[PDB]
């Protein structure tokens, strides 16, 4: 559709990055937001 | 770690516990990566064996332990056992245990570690170094 509908409703990868150094502070993969 | 007196002045132990009395003499062919020839002599200020122990033989360390076959040994710690090592245990103590004394004779010294009673240990065959040991003590 317009605008495109982007839903993070299935497993996804993510990265937390600091701008100055460009280094990766954190990394992860969400498979089940409720896993516990 | 812990050594082992073979006479009034000389104690024999593993090479790995030292540097990464009066003098130390690590085995000239000691390999710090494979722990092959992991043995050394310390001069200050049990008895050397005459035969290589074999599967089944008794021995002690408190807590007695039998010499496992090379087959078992080689395949429980694959890729880690050289021809100068043997296993002693079953099928804790914690990597820095005492020597394997089979009948008053020093048969083995800990190299990779003393396994756990709860499911073996890996030692250096002192039997294979008696010649280098006597020669070194006799000329030092």
């Amino acid at each position: 559709s317009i605008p495109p509908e982007v839903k993070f409703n299935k497993p996804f990868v993510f990265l937390m990055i600091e701008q100055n150094t460009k280094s990766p502070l954190f990394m992860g993969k969400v498979v089940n937001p409720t896993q516990k | 770690c812990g050594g082992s007196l073979i006479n009034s002045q000389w104690v024999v132990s593993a090479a790995h516990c030292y540097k990464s009395a009066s003098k130390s003499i690590v085995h000239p062919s000691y390999n710090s990566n494979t722990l092959n020839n992991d043995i050394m002599l310390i001069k200050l200020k049990i008895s050397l064996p005459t035969s290589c122990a074999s599967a089944g033989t008794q021995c002690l360390i408190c807590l007695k332990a039998p010499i496992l076959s090379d087959s078992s040994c080689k395949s429980a710690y694959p890729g880690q056992i050289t021809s100068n090592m043997f296993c002693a245990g079953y099928l804790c103590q914690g990597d820095s245990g005492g020597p394997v004394v089979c009948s008053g004779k020093l048969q083995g010294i800990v190299s990779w570690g003393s396994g756990c009673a709860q499911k073996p240990g890996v030692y250096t065959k002192v039997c294979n170094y008696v010649s280098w040991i006597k020669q070194t003590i006799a000329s030092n």
Binding site: V6, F8, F12, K22, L25 | -
Partner: protein, 335 residues
């Protein structure tokens, strides 16, 4: 501002190991934290136990001089601890020594200068109490997010190496709580769970890169930090995980290309707990865990070796921003 490409490749290497370990569990860790604990430890390490470690962190020892790697961490940590007044970001390193234990003086001065490390003395003979100290250090450091780092402390422990990283940022473009509805989340072909989905109709740094077969979203935080999210296309997760490299990330970070879109991002609260010994072994770091280890650069009193390598991290994502903490626990004992 460098050695960064190595850290990035270290993040991906370790990620692929944790992913291979389990494909049905959430994954959350901090590269910077694991990497500096091991980098700091290589300081008192010799020969090949030393090289395995540094090469295990993706460093080519023949291309970059050892002194410069440590200078890299020294600068990296200094920069991380000086964020824009709008972002909260802190890290801490701590050595826990046992009473007595004569440490090599060069080692102590190096961790102090190159890693800005703190140093404490404790009696590991009183396990429950020493365990209490380490845990409070980490707890205060991560502002309560991580309180039980050490569950088991060995009685013969000669020294412990600990570090923590804390982060708290606000979205540059927050979500509205009243817009958060509950929607489906498809864990896999057979399971579907319901979670609070945040929504926002607007302008985003988003795009569909066919090189990764997935949509890529970048959400800035107020200050000097950004969050990157990768949504793989159907059946393309494995492809995305293997195609990630430092160069690719570098490209996304240079263009602010924006566009209209309707975004659905779930709130989160996930945690990662790990025993890194085997996973690290798979990356070539094995000697420092055996009797063939050389830590003679730390102390000459006894022949030490690494007994445990524990890592813990927690994450929280809501409509205001993100909150995260990570911690590393390295225990050493006599052979």
């Amino acid at each position: 501002n460098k050695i960064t490409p190595n850290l990035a490749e270290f993040a991906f290497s370790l990620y692929r190991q944790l992913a291979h370990q389990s494909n049905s569990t959430n994954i959350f860790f901090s590269p910077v934290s694991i990497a500096t604990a091991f980098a700091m430890l290589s300081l008192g390490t010799k020969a090949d136990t030393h090289d395995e470690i540094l090469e295990g962190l993706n460093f080519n020892l023949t291309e970059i001089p050892e002194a410069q790697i440590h200078e890299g961490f020294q600068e990296l940590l200094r920069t991380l601890n000086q964020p824009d007044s709008q972002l909260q970001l802190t890290t801490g390193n701590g050595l826990f020594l046992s009473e007595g234990l004569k440490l090599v003086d060069k080692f102590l001065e190096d961790v102090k200068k190159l890693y800005h490390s703190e140093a404490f003395t404790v009696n590991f003979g009183d396990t429950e109490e020493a365990k209490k100290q380490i845990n409070d250090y980490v707890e205060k450091g991560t502002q309560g997010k991580i309180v039980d780092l050490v569950k088991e402390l060995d009685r013969d422990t000669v020294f412990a190496l600990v570090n923590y990283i804390f982060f708290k940022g606000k979205w540059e473009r927050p979500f509205e709580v009243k817009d958060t509805e509950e929607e489906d989340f498809h864990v896999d072909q057979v399971t579907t769970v319901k979670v609070p989905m945040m929504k926002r109709l607007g302008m985003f740094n988003i795009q569909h890169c066919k090189k990764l077969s997935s949509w890529v979203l970048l959400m800035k935080y107020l200050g000097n930090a950004t969050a990157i999210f990768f949504l793989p296309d159907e059946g393309k997760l494995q492809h995305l995980e293997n195609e990630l490299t430092h160069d690719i990330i570098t490209k996304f970070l240079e263009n602010e290309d924006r566009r209209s879109a309707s975004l659905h991002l779930p709130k989160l609260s996930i945690t990662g707990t790990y025993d890194l010994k085997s996973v690290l072994g798979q990356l070539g770091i094995t000697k420092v865990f055996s009797n063939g280890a050389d830590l003679s650069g730390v102390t000459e009193e006894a022949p030490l070796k690494l007994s445990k390598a524990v890592h813990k991290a927690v994450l929280t994502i809501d409509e205001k921003g993100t909150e995260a903490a990570g911690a590393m626990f390295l225990e050493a004992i006599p052979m």
